Amino acid sequence: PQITLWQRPLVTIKIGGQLKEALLDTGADDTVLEEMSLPGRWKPKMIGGIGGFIKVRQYDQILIEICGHKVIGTVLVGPTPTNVIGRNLLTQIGCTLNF
Amino acid sequence: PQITLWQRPLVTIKIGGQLKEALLDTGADDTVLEEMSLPGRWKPKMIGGIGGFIKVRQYDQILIEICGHKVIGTVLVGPTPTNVIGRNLLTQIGCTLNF
Numbered sequence: 001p002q003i004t005l006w007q008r009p010l011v012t013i014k015i016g017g018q019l020k021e022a023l024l025d026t027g028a029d030d031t032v033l034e035e036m037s038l039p040g041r042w043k044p045k046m047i048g049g050i051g052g053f054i055k056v057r058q059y060d061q062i063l064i065e066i067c068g069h070k071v072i073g074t075v076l077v078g079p080t081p082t083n084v085i086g087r088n089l090l091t092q093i094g095c096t097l098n099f
Numbered sequence: 100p101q102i103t104l105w106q107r108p109l110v111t112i113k114i115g116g117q118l119k120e121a122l123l124d125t126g127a128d129d130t131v132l133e134e135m136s137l138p139g140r141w142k143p144k145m146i147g148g149i150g151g152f153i154k155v156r157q158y159d160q161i162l163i164e165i166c167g168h169k170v171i172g173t174v175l176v177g178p179t180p181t182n183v184i185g186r187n188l189l190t191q192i193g194c195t196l197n198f
């Protein structure tokens with residue numbers, strides 16, 4: 001795809017068979033997700049956003065499908081109103097910013 | 100350019116007589132800069148992200164040069180940990196996401 005930015009770059013993703021909605025975010029180093037069931041063990045992490053710091057649950061080696069692109073990586077679960085796909089995963093589908 | 104995402108997509112911008120480094124951020128609705136002096140009228144605004152909400156000064160019709168484009172838009176100034184270029188200005192330089 002080529003996605004313009006007149007509206008939020010929301011895309012369907014698929015995790016553990018569930019379809020959900022996530023924002024493609026070039027300003028996010030990491031992928032941060034709303035509360036949901038993830039398979040393995042988690043460790044603690046703190047990360048910073050525009051509003052300040054939050055505590056998250058870090059899960060590794062998680063399979064996500066993004067617009068038909070399979071992707072495996074680290075996913076952070078915490079207080080967010082939006083699922084955010086960050087650079088750690090955008091680099092795996094070959095995403096670039098073009099102008 | 101075609102900008103890959105292995106590192107933070109930082110760009111030098113020119114605003115209110117000053118040179119700033121900022122983050123091309125497709126997950127941000129608005130442009131938000133670290134504390135600085137800017138010409139003109141401003142009104143207050145509340146914005147959010149990871150970590151919650153912050154209060155920022157909203158300045159309308161600000162001229163910003165980005166990679167040789169002179170664009171116009173609203174710029175917010177506030178206690179952000181980082182200067183961010185959001186979709187309101189990204190659309191104006193024709194920036195798209197591609198994969």
Ligand SMILES: CC(C)(C)OC(=O)N[C@@H](Cc1ccccc1)[C@H](O)CN[C@@H](Cc1ccccc1)C(=O)N[C@@H](CCC(=O)O)C(=O)N[C@@H](Cc1ccccc1)C(N)=O
Nearest residue numbers: 027028029030048049050082126127128129146147148149
């Ligand atoms: C997601 C992680 C990995 C934690 O990274 C960042 O948050 N990085 C931010 C930059 C940064 C780097 C280093 C240190 C500190 C900050 C990006 O801006 C992240 N982009 C989004 C992430 C996001 C999207 C959607 C929901 C929550 C969070 C963002 O904050 N976007 C804000 C930027 C500020 C702005 O545009 O005004 C936004 O669109 N805010 C809207 C939408 C909104 C409304 C209410 C609550 C939350 C979001 C708004 N009108 O305030």
Ligand SMILES: [Cl-]
Nearest residue numbers: 072073074088
């Ligand atoms: Cl990863």
Ligand SMILES: [Cl-]
Nearest residue numbers: 171172173187
């Ligand atoms: Cl604007």
Ligand SMILES: [Cl-]
Nearest residue numbers: 004005190193
């Ligand atoms: Cl366009």
Ligand code: NA
Nearest residue numbers: 103104105106
């Ligand atoms: Na690089």
